[PDB]
Design a protein around this ligand. Sequence first.
Ligand code: BR
Lengths: 119, 121, 95
Amino acid sequence: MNDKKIELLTTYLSLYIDHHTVLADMQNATGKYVVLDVRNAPAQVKKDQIKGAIAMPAKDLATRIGELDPAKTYVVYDWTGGTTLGKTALLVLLSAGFEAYELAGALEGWKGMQLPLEH
Amino acid sequence: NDKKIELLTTYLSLYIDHHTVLADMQNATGKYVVLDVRNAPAQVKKDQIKGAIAMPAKDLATRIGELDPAKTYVVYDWTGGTTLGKTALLVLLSAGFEAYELAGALEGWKGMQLPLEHHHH
Amino acid sequence: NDKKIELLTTYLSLYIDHHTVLADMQNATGKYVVLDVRNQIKGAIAMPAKDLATRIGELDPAKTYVVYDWTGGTTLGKTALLVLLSAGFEAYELA
Ligand SMILES: [Br-]
């Protein structure tokens, strides 16, 4: 019953990591995740970003991939859950053999929960 | 491309149109039960969809035993961009229930000025 | 990660870069046609996703259609895409 739906939902959800987990890593300084802001918009358009995030535009990821450490775990995020740069960056990383996840809720969710940002 | 159409068909089968939900709540068909799966704090503003049952996503699996199996459930979070709707949907479908996520979520519903439980008197 | 890579690959194939579309709207090539399927982008043809399954016969097959979802959702564009692709049309959703 609803086998196809369940299969897609399970694979789909496995792409993400909960913001609570990301939040605890920074508040405990456990060094578990490296947060990448993969939006392609200019800095003047982005305005703010998740606290401690690294600007790694999806369009340059391939070229700057050598900058990332293979032994770490990456979390990518875009404007919203509907934008596709999060998934695009995730695909590049997973395809490259990197351990990565997309931030559930994206930047929109983070801001909605009044979580830490920076300019 | 069969793979594209295949994905689109399955992905869309997860959602239900607001028009379908609206028509049902105005014709008294009683075919759908709306579940507000937003986090508890957000639901304090009492801005839920008309007739929606307050059921925080993190409590769904626990309170799913209070639901009528003959009804079709429609879940929604404050916005469609989150994964709370799909996570709730997975719980319901895995339990043998018929459910769908509301297209547009709460933001979209309000955006269309659709019926909310509490309104001007 | 095979299942993840597979899903992501098919999912992303549904979309087209705004850069490619924009350039075409200036390149004087005019091979892309933008459809606003809301039930604004200048030059876009207003065609509701609900009426698409009836007006789609007013489309030139030699053109690639790009569905634009103003609300930035993930279902409106897909509804329109499903209709267009099933009809044999080449189409993508504007990312
Ligand atoms: Br962007």
